[PDB]
Curated annotation (Swiss-Prot), chains A, B:
The chain holds residues 50 to 106 of 881 of the full protein. The lineage of its organism: Eukaryota, Fungi, Dikarya, Ascomycota, Saccharomycotina. It is found in: Nucleus. This protein is a positive regulator for the gene expression of the galactose-induced genes such as GAL1, GAL2, GAL7, GAL10, and MEL1 which code for the enzymes used to convert galactose to glucose. It recognizes a 17 base pair sequence in (5'-CGGRNNRCYNYNCNCCG-3') the upstream activating sequence (UAS-G) of these genes. Association between GAL11 and GAL4 may serve to expedite phosphorylation of GAL4. Present with 166 molecules/cell in log phase SD medium. The 9aaTAD motif (residues 862 to 870) is a transactivation domain present in a large number of yeast and animal transcription factors. This is Regulatory protein GAL4. Binds DNA as a homodimer. Interacts directly with the mediator subunits GAL11/MED15 and SRB4/MED17.
């Protein structure tokens, strides 16, 4: 019992804080832009959706 | 004595693969839903946007 964790833990953990393919650096739009196919902004840009829905039923 | 990395590395690294507040389990919509304020689906649901833009200029 004189090693493990602490350093290494802070290591892969530090890698966990750096992320890989989640947080590039800034801008919180590339996410929803890469996940959404604009089928909403499109379904509306062409079908002009108009109605109520609200949240939590 | 040999140690560090391997186990611990796979440890915090395993924690990195489990994520914390990024991947809940399965949705693919909760992300863009929590990032986007529906100001687009709204700006269109009320202002009915219609025009060309394309990608990459």
């Amino acid at each position: 019992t004189r090693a493990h964790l602490t350093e290494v833990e802070s290591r892969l953990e530090r890698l966990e804080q750096l992320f890989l393919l989640i947080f590039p650096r800034e801008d919180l739009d590339m996410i929803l832009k890469m996940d959404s196919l604009r089928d909403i902004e499109a379904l509306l840009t062409g079908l002009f959706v108009q109605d109520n829905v609200n949240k939590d039923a």
